[PDB]
């Protein structure tokens, strides 16, 4: 197991970034349960969102794999919790390490972009009727992210 993994974990453990919780699984070190507090003054805010992070052995060569385990309303997160963030795909560079990624996700909620977001339907509403969409997001948060 590469030294790096521990360290990153360790500082993660030793120090926690605000608005986030990251617990490694006991069975496997490379696997993580992460809980993200919704951005303040975001419709999500007040909700808590589960994610799971895993890193292929190839990491950092290979970007980590991240997914939402909590159902959430957003253009860039699909029905299965799959996130479309570019730093996970094309833009991935080894230096970045998890801690960063996580914050990057935190931002995304705050800053929804319709940029080939997978869910055009989410996209469609968000461009057409942002007000509505935002309301729906809050709804789902209530429904799913309050427990």
């Amino acid at each position: 197991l590469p030294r790096r993994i521990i360290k990153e974990t360790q500082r993660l453990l030793a120090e926690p970034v605000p608005g986030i919780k990251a617990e490694p699984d006991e069975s496997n070190a490379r696997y993580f349960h992460v809980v993200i507090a919704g951005p303040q003054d975001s419709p999500f805010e007040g909700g808590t969102f589960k994610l799971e992070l895993f890193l292929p052995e190839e990491y950092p060569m290979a970007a980590p794999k991240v997914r939402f385990m909590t159902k959430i309303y957003h253009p860039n997160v699909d029905k299965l919790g799959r996130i479309k963030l570019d730093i996970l795909a094309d833009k991935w560079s080894p230096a970045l390490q998890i801690r960063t990624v996580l914050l990057s996700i935190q931002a995304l909620l705050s800053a929804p972009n319709p940029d080939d977001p997978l869910a055009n339907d989410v996209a469609e509403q968000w461009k057409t009727n942002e007000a509505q969409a935002i309301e729906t997001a809050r709804a789902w948060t209530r429904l799913y992210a309050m427990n």
Partner: protein
């Protein structure tokens, strides 16, 4: 060494399924799109050539246990079929009857399983069996 959590592994399978594979004679994919747990899955087998099965479509249902892929997944046909290992009443496959299910390895994937069944249809004991009229189910 390297342990791959279920869900992520399931995703890996899912992505490959959508891509489709090779001949495309067998295919798999998810039963319901709103399921986060990726448990309920649908499979398709195309009946191998020059056997009573040939030129036929069989749909399956596959469930993936919490300890998939460590434990093998439960499988059953939805289209009617006469076959060793395949319970006729239920269209459910006895684990032990089938070598891969009996000898399950965490490495095996659904894809493997289906080819397995397809492969198995061609075997002498099966290829000979009379089959029902097209399109009945249990």
């Amino acid at each position: 060494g390297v342990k791959v959590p279920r869900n992520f592994r399931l995703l890996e399978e899912l992505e490959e399924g959508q891509k489709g594979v090779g001949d495309g004679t067998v295919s798999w994919g998810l039963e319901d799109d709103e399921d986060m747990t990726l448990t309920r899955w649908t499979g398709m087998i195309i009946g191998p050539p020059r056997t009573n099965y040939e030129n036929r479509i069989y749909s399956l249902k596959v469930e993936c246990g919490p300890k998939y892929p460590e434990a093998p997944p439960s499988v059953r046909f939805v289209t009617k079929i006469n076959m060793n290992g395949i319970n006729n009443s239920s269209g459910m496959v006895d684990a032990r009857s089938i070598p891969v299910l009996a000898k399950w390895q965490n490495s095996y994937s659904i894809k493997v399983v289906l080819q397995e069944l397809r492969r198995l249809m061609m075997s002498k004991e099966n290829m000979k069996l009379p089959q029902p009229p097209e399109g009945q189910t249990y």
